[PDB]
Amino acid sequence: VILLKEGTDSSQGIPQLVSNISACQVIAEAVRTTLGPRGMDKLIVDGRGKATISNDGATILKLLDVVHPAAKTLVDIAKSQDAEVGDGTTSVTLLAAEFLKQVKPYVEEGLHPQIIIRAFRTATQLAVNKIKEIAVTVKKADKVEQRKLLEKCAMTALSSKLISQQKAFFAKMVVDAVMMLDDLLQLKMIGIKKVQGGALEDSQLVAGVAFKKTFSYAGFEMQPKKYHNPKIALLNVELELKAEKDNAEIRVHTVEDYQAIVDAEWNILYDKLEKIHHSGAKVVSSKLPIGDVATQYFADRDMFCAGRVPEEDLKRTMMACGGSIQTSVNALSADVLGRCQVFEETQIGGERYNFFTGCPKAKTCTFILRGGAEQFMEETERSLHDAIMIVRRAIKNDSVVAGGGAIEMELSKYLRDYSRTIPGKQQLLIGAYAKALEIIPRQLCDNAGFDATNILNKLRARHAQGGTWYGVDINNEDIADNFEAFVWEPAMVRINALTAASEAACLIVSVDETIKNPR
Amino acid sequence: KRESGRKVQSGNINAAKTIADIIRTCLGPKSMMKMLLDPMGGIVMTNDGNAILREIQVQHPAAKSMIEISRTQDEEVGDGTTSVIILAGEMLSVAEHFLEQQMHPTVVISAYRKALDDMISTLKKISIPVDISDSDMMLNIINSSITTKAISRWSSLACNIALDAVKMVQFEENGRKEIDIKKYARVEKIPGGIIEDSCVLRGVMINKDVTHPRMRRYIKNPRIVLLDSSLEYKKGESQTDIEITREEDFTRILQMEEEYIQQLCEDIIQLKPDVVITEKGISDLAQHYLMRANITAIRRVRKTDNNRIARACGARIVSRPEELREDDVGTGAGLLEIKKIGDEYFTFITDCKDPKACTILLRGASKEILSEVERNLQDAMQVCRNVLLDPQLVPGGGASEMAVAHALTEKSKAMTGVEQWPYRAVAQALEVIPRTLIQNCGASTIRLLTSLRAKHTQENCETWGVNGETGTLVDMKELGIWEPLAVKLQTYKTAVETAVLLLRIDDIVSGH
Amino acid sequence: LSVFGDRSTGETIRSQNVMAAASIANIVKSSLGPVGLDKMLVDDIGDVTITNDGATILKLLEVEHPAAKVLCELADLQDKEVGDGTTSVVIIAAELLKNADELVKQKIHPTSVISGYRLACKEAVRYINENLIVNTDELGRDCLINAAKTSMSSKIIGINGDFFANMVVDAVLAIKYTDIRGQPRYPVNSVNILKAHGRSQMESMLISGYALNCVVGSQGMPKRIVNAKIACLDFSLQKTKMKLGVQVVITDPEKLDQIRQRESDITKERIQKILATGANVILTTGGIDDMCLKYFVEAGAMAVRRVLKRDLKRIAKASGATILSTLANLEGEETFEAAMLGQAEEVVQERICDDELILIKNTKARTSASIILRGANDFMCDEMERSLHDALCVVKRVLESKSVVPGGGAVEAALSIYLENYATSMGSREQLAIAEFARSLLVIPNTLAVNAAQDSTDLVAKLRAFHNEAQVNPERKNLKWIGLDLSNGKPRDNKQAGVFEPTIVKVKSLKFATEAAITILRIDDLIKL
Ligand SMILES: Nc1ncnc2c1ncn2[C@@H]1O[C@H](COP(=O)(O)OP(=O)(O)OP(=O)(O)O)[C@@H](O)[C@H]1O
Ligand SMILES: Nc1ncnc2c1ncn2[C@@H]1O[C@H](COP(=O)(O)OP(=O)(O)OP(=O)(O)O)[C@@H](O)[C@H]1O
Ligand SMILES: Nc1ncnc2c1ncn2[C@@H]1O[C@H](COP(=O)(O)OP(=O)(O)OP(=O)(O)O)[C@@H](O)[C@H]1O
């Protein structure tokens, strides 16, 4: 009747590790098919009933939330992958579980897990020095300008897509968008907007901030668009006559104050409009909708107004204009006002759009898409976001390696040759570490629908002859030199993915007993 | 179905430990009785370890191998079978070095066979020579088995039976000193008389009775004849049968039966014999021509018993009855006698020498007394055989066990390697023989065994044994609890040979 | 569907066929090698036989399953081809099926596995035959003396290893005779190992000739003879009989006497024809008459009686003489002159303690000798005779087959590196067939390391670490032909240790195991009636 546990969940030994190895593979199976540009997307619905459609590995693991202990160790590695390099959560999640799969029969035969720890620290340290030797610095090779080279890598990334016919036009726009930025490159600075209707040739690139402008109220035939130096105001105040938040209800029984009651309710709107006139804001941007009466106010005062602006586009306008977002109207002064050189109301796509050009802090851009469907523009937005990512990493890091499994099949060949010259327990473990690194060219053939065994048998035969930069091709169903086809990746992200996958595989192997407190 | 791995290494351990736990308390003069339950309700309360495991059926292949290795050991020597199964179960009982340390059995077998060489080397150091020429020293050896028996009233005469039997069978001319009690010392039982009437004669006795008075009663020069062929109707090379149902077939068969036998009997009576001995049977009509010459008819004798007759008189083994000659004579024999002993007739071809053969004649008041002496003398003959095989004794009663286990502890301090850990386990497994002697006496076991090891360390290891009567420790040089060396040599050898066989088994599979 | 049984197809009959075949490998897993463990063979009657030899294990193993019944017939194809190798085929072919079963789950059809295995087997014989050793180094250069010394280490003879290894090396090279076109093999008959009490084990002498364990009897006849004629006969010169079961009739008493006088007179006639041939060496199984031995001590013929029959078959084969069963030539009595006699040089009655032996020297065609194992007691002489017989068959079975290969894990460890580099040279959906063929050959040092009580992850990997350096650079600092010493748990060179295996036991093992793994892998449907 006297128990030591009394509800304490605890177990140790060999099958506690086998239960932790197989529990690691259920997280890798959630992001196994999402690898590659042609990968399958997952459908995740929240508690409210909204379905989310995405194939990004960072968005899948953030909405999984598995209560298993070994599954929580793959979450913070994907969190640290965003801080170390910026992306690569689906690469280190798949690579961590395949390290444990190849050593899973070796644990059951009686081998100690600490010897597998000493092999993972050894082969990963050799993989760091092997990457930097094969990595070549391509800065001014063959006397070609870097603007021509940046259009070549985006052409292969945008190939086999909806805009694969007109990829020559889309490759020149993604290079000039990053070239418009400063030395501090960021994917959040270049925004993508969608305009329904028209062919694919009508896609434009805004040098500044452009938003959807769903303001469909009155205000035509006045409020001229062209301004030399307007004062950009970012508000969050409703300017309607009968607003849901700004009203005045006083209950008197006199007929003299009944004129003053409607006048006091109008004075809430009029004093909020008079403070914008004193501050000198030529353009009025508000999140809440603006009524038809306030549009008649700025029409005679030679100013512009446009409400129903999202708060995401208001913060991008704040980073462009250099001002500040002010909710109230009495604090509206020149400290929070912005400035630009060109502002105009365009008629691209049949609807009205507003955009600023010539900001002093113009570090943000806007990409306008044109097409016959919004889901055509939704997949074009994610493909152009992928086209910006390959261009951005080529400018920051010059020392690059060949992608497409070329650096993974070369690391599998060197670590297999090093294992044959090492006696002891490091031969069967590092040799299993080299075979576990072949899951990146194997899952790239699985998600692309190709023959996974017909390509990988010819890919390893190409590496055995002396091919150091041969990998899989997403367009053709054969192997190709990814260095000649401009399929690149920097050496620093390939190194940091290997030291994160080896650290995530070492944390599972070093755990042998689970302690749970009853509460 | 099938079983392999480490489960059969633990499955054969519990199969041998269950047999050893049954007869563990049946050691010494205070051996506890065991009750066997029959399906018909019968109960036998025998405390003999050979009688317990014989009437118990086993189903395990390792437990079946445990019984037969002691049964063959019972046929070699007549003492020490209980100590084999106890020591074979104790060596495998420490399974902490077999399973918990994840040790392969090859390390254990290399440690067990290396400990086997220290078994023979230690027993020759604690040994003592025996003055076998003095009959008083031989009486102090065989008396350990004559106690609490019905033969103990005649211990001075029963000791002369077994001592004279082993010396005639043992041949000093051959060098190796062979003794085989089963052939050259065939024991026969004769009802009637008393225990004092039983003596030893120098010859071979025939238990065939006398059916006709026309025989040789007293012949001083016995003319013996040996023959291998049969004395019956002539059969052919085929497998036909003989059936006499017609009167015409009864006359033709009997006329051929008489003419062939008279032709056979004319060749043996031309030499004027005294007793005929045929290998096969003798028909009724064959005695009709034989009784006219007054010859004693002896039939149905084995081929193994035939050479003892030929070495007694010096006759020639003749294959066919037509090929007799004058060299088939038994000149030199003492006397031929067909005198009745207790209304049973026995033929005597005894002599006044040692013709490489003997027999034992037992007498008693009832047939239960005849079975009591033959089971006590055969147990006494194999013990005194081991003394004359090698005149060396060891201090018994647990003194030799603590002397051997003391030598293994000092030897293990200089034995380096991984194999020193199962090497020390044999020293604690050999302590189970003085452990059960104190437990059967009723005293405190660990209180006495700890002081037993302290006496074996400082004092001499040849003394300070255990007395299984009072329950305390006595000196083995004062009491006659001395064991033979060849019994204790084969006891530790078989206990290692059992442990090398059960630990080497790693798979049990079926198949006819 | 209404059929006469149950039907089952798909990959579930592939997984059931490899689990039934690999379970038979576990029956012969621990019994591999010279340190193999015994296993109990339970019969249907109730008795059990303790056998550790793997050839007798598979003969008594009865598993009523068609996947296990395939591996039963390869034991009959192994002994009829060479005579050894049997369970090494079973562990290789079952690990071939277990690695191929993982390929079925990895979306590979078995047709690429079957065609990949035949090209991996033919390239395995090519890499073996390019790294062989011709049968030589019989005298002057040791990999022999040291070869038989390892077999002699398990007994008490191994205290003085250099003294007793010289007795078996010169005895193996003495029994060599071509006899067909330059074959040279070694016969199943070997030297006769006798024993005596020569007060220690160091008084053994290498006698270059056969030694008979018989005593001549009388002393007045001279023990040193010079003539070459050797007579062998099986009929007794003692008083003869018609049959042991059929006898002649004797009726009259005086008729019995005159056939005894005729037996004394017909013995005088037979000795006149034996000594007319000049044969002094007289060896008789049935015995020699007492008055007949009187004629031999005056003529000087070396007559030996009560000789064994199996000893006389090696004596008549030595001098090239014919064994005479009966002296009567179907109408009379003759001695068959110049037919049953051989030639020799010298027969000396050497004084050996407790058994004065008869040595023969320089016969016609014998090639055999004798080793006198003089010792102290019967315990040390009986264990040393089986140690000489076990060391004889080790050197015999190697130096027969016309070329040998350093075995004991040296063959399969070198094949695990070459066949992997050959697998990366072909491609065409058969790279994984040959790469798993190299890993399936590693079970031969893997089962040998677990039977040697060593770490199997270290001892197998030490074999591949030395064999890889022979393929990277041809420098002599690379260790080549590294075997596996299971006694000390350390890899050594097989050329220094003398551990050698025939090529036909290594070639036919890889040939039969891949053809057995092909037949089980071709099973995709099960039909029962
Ligand atoms: N255009 C391309 N052609 C061929 N292979 C490619 C191409 N782009 C990427 N790859 C390969 O796909 C793999 C990554 O696939 P995917 O883009 O689905 O993950 P990821 O988003 O890069 O992961 P992470 O965000 O962790 O870096 C890389 O190893 C790379 O070699
Ligand atoms: N009074 C005593 N005290 C202690 N030990 C004794 C005493 N008398 C005899 N012994 C010892 O007990 C031993 C007998 O033990 P145990 O009964 O186990 O074997 P056993 O049955 O005689 O052997 P076997 O079956 O071969 O006859 C004898 O060898 C003797 O040395
Ligand atoms: N002198 C030696 N040194 C080291 N290993 C050896 C030596 N001789 C043989 N071996 C190993 O022992 C194994 C032989 O095992 P075993 O004799 O128990 O069965 P087997 O002969 O393989 O069965 P079968 O008779 O069918 O072929 C071989 O694989 C070989 O590697």
mmCIF file of C-alpha atoms in Angstrom, chain B residues 28 51 67 87 101 118 120 131 140 153 173 185 188 198 205 219 238 253 273 288 335 379 412 421 426 457 463 472 478:
data_model
loop_
_atom_site.group_PDB
_atom_site.id
_atom_site.type_symbol
_atom_site.label_atom_id
_atom_site.label_comp_id
_atom_site.label_asym_id
_atom_site.label_seq_id
_atom_site.Cartn_x
_atom_site.Cartn_y
_atom_site.Cartn_z
ATOM 1 C CA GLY B 28 25.418 -37.506 5.466
ATOM 2 C CA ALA B 51 16.093 -44.300 -5.670
ATOM 3 C CA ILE B 67 19.900 -37.845 -13.938
ATOM 4 C CA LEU B 87 27.760 -29.770 -6.606
ATOM 5 C CA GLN B 101 27.294 -9.174 -15.965
ATOM 6 C CA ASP B 118 43.333 -27.092 -9.335
ATOM 7 C CA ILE B 120 43.420 -32.666 -8.830
ATOM 8 C CA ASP B 131 48.977 -49.458 4.439
ATOM 9 C CA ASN B 140 38.316 -48.754 9.106
ATOM 10 C CA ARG B 153 26.112 -58.350 13.187
ATOM 11 C CA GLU B 173 50.924 -58.514 -13.715
ATOM 12 C CA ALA B 185 32.971 -61.564 -9.412
ATOM 13 C CA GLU B 188 24.666 -65.372 -6.811
ATOM 14 C CA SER B 198 28.147 -67.486 3.325
ATOM 15 C CA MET B 205 28.859 -71.961 -9.943
ATOM 16 C CA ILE B 219 34.793 -86.639 -9.843
ATOM 17 C CA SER B 238 15.752 -70.575 -44.839
ATOM 18 C CA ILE B 253 10.773 -85.789 -38.040
ATOM 19 C CA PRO B 273 33.702 -86.854 -20.371
ATOM 20 C CA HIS B 288 18.290 -89.930 -23.476
ATOM 21 C CA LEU B 335 36.497 -81.517 -8.091
ATOM 22 C CA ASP B 379 28.083 -51.135 -2.298
ATOM 23 C CA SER B 412 42.723 -16.131 -7.197
ATOM 24 C CA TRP B 421 35.325 -13.361 -10.884
ATOM 25 C CA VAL B 426 33.638 -22.036 -7.535
ATOM 26 C CA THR B 457 43.152 -20.595 7.450
ATOM 27 C CA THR B 463 42.304 -31.320 9.877
ATOM 28 C CA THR B 472 30.254 -29.629 15.934
ATOM 29 C CA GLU B 478 40.897 -38.692 15.170
#
